[PDB]
Amino acid sequence: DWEIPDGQITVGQRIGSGSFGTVYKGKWHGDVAVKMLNVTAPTPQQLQAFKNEVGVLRKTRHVNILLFMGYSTKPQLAIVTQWCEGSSLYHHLHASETKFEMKKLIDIARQTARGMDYLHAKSIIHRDLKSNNIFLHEDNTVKIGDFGSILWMAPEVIRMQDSNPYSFQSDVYAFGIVLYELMTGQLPYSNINNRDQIIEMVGRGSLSPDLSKVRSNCPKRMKRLMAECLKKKRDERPSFPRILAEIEELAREL
């Protein structure tokens, strides 16, 4: 059992917020992040729903997945994880503009594939993967977390006509854009000027990333892999086991 007794966790400074929760730097046996939920006086239906989430995070032990550490119910509902020192991949690519060589790009890609392969092997779907949620701890280890971001949405998710739009396949499409970014240094749809046009065309099936924009030294295997992850028909995208293996072969050739 992972319930952290009351008065042990010190809560510091507000970092920000994502899909759910508000995130803080904290302390508990060293550094932790503290994701507050803001539920005051949980009903049995909110309490069990909290433990359902806890029970999905607890199911993950992997080096490339953000490390679930504990939870509080008093004084707030809250989740404690490992603290990533450094900043995110989004930040490294379109803020710092950090000059990674291809060795490092593909390494990052490989470590993210490992995490997603793990997530999928344990039947867990991310639902909001993006470079913003790929944390480079110590500028070396990818930590995936965070289970206004339509550039990573697959067509079937932007449509939302299906009963179950989120899937492994939509997780795989999202990874394809993380690859676009990695290999172009750029967010996709550079020159389309209004998100409503990007939504429409992706959803109607008439707009995917222009892969002629990839950097000169981009591998040919990686070109092919991106193309296959970014396919419009759901069922024609590769599973992560194969994504991982093509990048692991790629990493060696390099």
Ligand X SMILES: CC(C)(C)c1nc(-c2cccc(NS(=O)(=O)c3c(F)cccc3F)c2F)c(-c2ccnc(N)n2)s1
81 binds ligand X (CB under 6 A): yes
Is 16 annotated as contributing to ligand binding?
yes
17 binds ligand X (CB under 6 A): yes
What would the two tokens of residue 151 be?
């550039």
User: Is 145 or 219 the residue whose CB approaches ligand X more closely?
Assistant: 145
User: Is 66 or 116 the residue whose CB approaches ligand X more closely?
Assistant: 66
Tell the smallest beta-carbon distance from residue 71 to ligand X (Å).
9
Give every CB contact of residue 88 below 8 A, 6+ residues apart in sequence.
131, 132, 133, 134, 135, 136
Is 35 annotated as contributing to ligand binding?
yes
Question: Rounded to whole angstroms, how far apart are CA atoms 47 and 92?
Answer: 38
Active site residues: 128
Site residues (CB under 6 A) for ligand X, limited to 150-209: none
Q: In one letter, which amino acid is 251? A: A
Site residues (CB under 6 A) for ligand X, limited to 215-244: none
b vs e for 102-132, b when ≥16 Cβ sit within 10 Å of the residue's Cβ?
Answer: eebbbbbbbbbbbbbbbbbeeebbbebbbbb
83 binds ligand X (CB under 6 A): yes
User: Is 145 or 203 the residue whose CB approaches ligand X more closely?
Assistant: 145
Site residues (CB under 6 A) for ligand X, limited to 128-147: 135, 145-147
Question: Rounded to whole angstroms, how far apart are CA atoms 184 and 228?
Answer: 17
Q: Which residue is nearest to ligand X (CB)?
A: 145
66 binds ligand X (CB under 6 A): yes
DSSP state of 236: G
What would the two tokens of residue 180 be?
């676009």
Of 26, 35, 209, 231, the one binding ligand X (CB under 6 A) is 35
Question: Rounded to whole angstroms, how far apart are CA atoms 70 and 2?
Answer: 5
- Sequence ranges of the binding site for ATP: 15-23, 35
Binding site for ligand X (CB under 6 A): 15-18, 23, 33, 35, 57, 66, 68, 79, 81, 83-84, 135, 145-147
